[PDB]
Design a binder for these strands. Sequence first.
DNA 1: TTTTTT
Length: 117
Amino acid sequence: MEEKVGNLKPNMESVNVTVRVLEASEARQIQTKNGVRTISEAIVGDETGRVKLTLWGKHAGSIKEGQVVKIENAWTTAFKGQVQLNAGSKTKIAEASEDGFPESSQIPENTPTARRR
DNA sequence: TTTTTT
């Protein structure tokens, strides 16, 4: 029930995927139209590409460094034309152990993008 | 306390 990065699409209220940490920034406060929240940004991806991860509130800076994680049902929002991934409440992040997920130095950087008419 | 920024 989990899709890959090279097969993900924006505007989805549900996105399940397994990837590795490519980067991680400390948690900072942002100013929205609904007030102030605490979020952070961390780069992840797998052998199918790469997608920017956006943690929300407690997930902010709560993640680890290049380690095997498992993204859950979150969502995707297209910023500036490029798809993006986030992690909030219905999303549960946790370390996952497999047969050895691809390293960050061997993880593609292909940016997923839906097809336009 | 799903909004973020290029």
